[PDB]
Ligand binder design. Structure first.
Ligand code: H5A
Length: 182
């Protein structure tokens, strides 16, 4: 409907797949080569379904900060026959607050879904499902089951992936450029 939705749609159309684990179907952001991200609570194993294709997992790393606190991001390398467009130049370098973000989701349950979530706070610490978590972004939208892994963007930046909510607020894990230096 506007330039925010334009950027979000460009990311969804080329850099997302539908990931299925034993814990559910998730929006999965492809970042470069065969490397993607997903919430850690997806519990990625040795095998994952990618757009309903059985796919070997070459590597999976559940990220933690240097205080050894959960970040809720798993980086997955997929045994896929095709690379993602490299979008690392759209990742922020530092923790920040943002204006006018979009949360985009693509699954069987929620195809081509885009939500204007407005202002995004650098919230920091969250007890996420009982797990102390750092680098959380917060937005005031009543996000639901089915939106986990959803991409959070502004115009020109891919800033986070949706990991939870409390009925009134939604919470995303930050994506930082430094996670994807190879
Ligand atoms: C349609 O929105 C954009 C898409 C892309 C892209 O390369 O996908 C790059 C942009 O910045 C130059 C955009 O504007 C912020």
């Amino acid at each position: 409907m506007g330039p925010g939705f334009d950027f979000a749609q460009a990311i969804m159309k080329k850099n997302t797949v539908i990931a299925r684990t034993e814990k559910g179907e998730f929006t999965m952001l492809g970042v470069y080569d065969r490397v993607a991200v997903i919430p850690t609570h997806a519990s990625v194993g040795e095998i994952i379904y990618i757009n309903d294709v059985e796919t070997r997992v070459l590597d999976a790393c559940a990220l933690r900060d240097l205080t050894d606190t959960n970040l809720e991001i798993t980086i997955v390398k997929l045994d896929r026959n095709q690379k993602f467009r490299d979008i690392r130049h759209f990742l922020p370098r530092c923790e920040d607050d943002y204006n006018d973000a979009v949360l985009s989701v693509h699954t069987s349950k929620f195809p081509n879904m885009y939500i204007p979530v407005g202002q995004v706070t650098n919230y920091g610490f969250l007890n996420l499902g009982g797990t102390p978590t750092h680098r959380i972004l917060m937005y005031n939208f009543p996000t639901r089951a089915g939106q986990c892994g959803g991409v959070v963007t502004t115009t020109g930046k891919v800033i986070g992936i949706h990991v939870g909510g409390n009925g009134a607020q939604g919470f995303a894990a930050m994506l930082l450029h430094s996670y994807f230096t190879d």
